[PDB]
Amino acid sequence: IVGGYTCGANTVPYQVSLNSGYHFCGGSLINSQWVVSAAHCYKSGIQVRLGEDNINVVEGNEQFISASKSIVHPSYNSNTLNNDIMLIKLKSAASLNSRVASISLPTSCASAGTQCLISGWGNTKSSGTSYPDVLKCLKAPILSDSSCKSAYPGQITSNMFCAGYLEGGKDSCQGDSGGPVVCSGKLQGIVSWGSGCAQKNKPGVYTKVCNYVSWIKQTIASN
Ligand SMILES: [Ca+2]
């Protein structure tokens, strides 16, 4: 997250870190046994880390649980990035409490101008790299479909939206992929892609979770 702020420990209790000997992506806890992340985050050897603030120090409140299933959307396209969503089933259920809690799925899509909270342990620099110890947060609005398509012509599908700031300085970044975009208590987005980070006229692009609620429910019910 570039241009954000330190969330505060456990203030985003649905935020998870996906770890393979290092933090590589975020995710969102949607019930005690399932996490939503990005398809492009798929790999073998995923350990889900819940309850984290400083990802480099054991502080208390962490739960480390291996992924038992990692289900990339069958129609994920690694060139267009359409359908950039994955479900992870935990080997055991997480213990839910104030510091580890699920986030609700949307019942409807969010409108342009809706304010959201985006979070992660990704890069905090627009040029160069700096990775934080603690979780970072950014408040950001959803942009209009016309502004999003103007920024990224030919590249925005119905399963994507833009959020952030066209003036530069405030965005998600590498290391944030798979993490949450929460608006009015609902998980509306997944950190997906963008051109650079926090660059003028190049907002973040996010998977439009409201299009996948039925797919998520059906996939969880059958697994
Ligand atoms: Ca920790």
Side-chain angles (χ1 to χ4, degrees), residues 1-199 201 203-223:
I1 303 289
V2 177
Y5 60 94
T6 293
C7 304
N10 310 296
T11 57
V12 188
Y14 54 83
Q15 171 83 230
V16 309
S17 171
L18 303 185
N19 184 285
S20 52
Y22 57 98
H23 165 82
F24 69 91
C25 272
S28 301
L29 190 66
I30 63 161
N31 65 40
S32 66
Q33 215 158 176
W34 290 90
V35 166
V36 170
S37 187
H40 84 255
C41 292
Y42 173 82
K43 57 166 72 190
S44 302
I46 297 180
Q47 186 180 244
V48 181
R49 298 190 171 196
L50 304 104
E52 287 282 20
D53 189 45
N54 188 324
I55 48 164
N56 297 306
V57 171
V58 176
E59 294 184 291
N61 317 304
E62 293 95 351
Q63 299 170 229
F64 295 177
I65 307 173
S66 295
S68 62
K69 304 181 179 296
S70 302
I71 303 181
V72 167
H73 195 285
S75 295
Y76 172 60
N77 186 306
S78 61
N79 288 123
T80 62
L81 319 184
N82 196 206
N83 310 120
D84 194 10
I85 185 166
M86 173 175 67
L87 266 31
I88 292 170
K89 193 179 185 182
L90 303 181
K91 183 175 179 185
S92 52
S95 295
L96 302 184
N97 57 62
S98 66
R99 302 172 176 96
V100 179
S102 58
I103 190 66
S104 293
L105 293 176
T107 48
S108 54
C109 297
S111 302
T114 300
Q115 291 283 342
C116 305
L117 184 72
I118 308 180
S119 51
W121 292 272
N123 191 4
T124 63
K125 294 189 167 169
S126 63
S127 54
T129 62
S130 183
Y131 285 87
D133 291 331
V134 303
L135 186 66
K136 301 294 176 174
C137 274
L138 176 67
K139 293 180 193 184
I142 297 178
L143 308 188
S144 70
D145 196 61
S146 54
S147 290
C148 191
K149 292 176 170 177
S150 289
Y152 297 112
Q155 310 157 72
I156 304 299
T157 70
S158 64
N159 301 307
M160 300 169 193
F161 67 91
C162 295
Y165 298 88
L166 300 175
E167 65 270 33
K170 285 184 172 181
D171 201 358
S172 60
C173 201
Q174 280 68 44
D176 292 320
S177 284
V181 181
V182 168
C183 318
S184 304
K186 306 300 188 188
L187 183 67
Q188 293 286 8
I190 305 165
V191 178
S192 183
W193 65 273
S195 177
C197 299
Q199 298 308 107
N201 292 327
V205 190
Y206 301 92
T207 310
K208 195 174 183 177
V209 175
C210 64
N211 291 358
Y212 297 96
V213 171
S214 297
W215 178 82
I216 292 167
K217 291 182 173 301
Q218 293 180 348
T219 300
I220 289 175
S222 58
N223 282 279

